[PDB]
Amino acid sequence: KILAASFNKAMTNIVDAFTGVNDAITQTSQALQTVATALNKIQDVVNQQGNSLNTILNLTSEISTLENKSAELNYTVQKLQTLIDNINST
């Protein structure tokens, strides 16, 4: 029964660790959204200064790629949570 006790201890820490990883993925999702936003504001001002100086700054796809990736990480966060719960049931 050294094995069964070791297994539950392992599973408990494996569950906590995937929970920690899940947070890092969350913080990364948010950091990525924050960047998308920064590119957004940059896109505005630089194009306004480009209009008062009268090259177009176009970051729309970079912006949308980043908000998509950010959403994708959220899917992962959800799918991971399901798996974490499953691990916890053993």
Among the listed residues 13, 31, 20, the one whose alpha carbon sits nearest the alpha carbon of residue 80: 20
Helix (H, G, I), strand (E, B) or coil at 7: helix
Q: How far is CA 90 from the centre of its chain?
A: 28
DSSP codes, 10-58: HHHHHHHHHHHHHHHHHHHHHHHHHHHHHHHHHHHHHHHHHHH------
Interface with its own copies in residues 28-87 (CB under 8 A): 28, 30-32, 34-35, 37-39, 41-42, 44-46, 48-50, 53, 55-59, 62-63, 65-66, 69-70, 72-73, 76-77, 79-80, 83-84, 86-87
**Binding residues vs its own copies (CB under 8 A):** 2-4, 6-7, 9-11, 13-14, 16-18, 20-21, 23-25, 27-28, 30-32, 34-35, 37-39, 41-42, 44-46, 48-50, 53, 55-59, 62-63, 65-66, 69-70, 72-73, 76-77, 79-80, 83-84, 86-87, 89-90
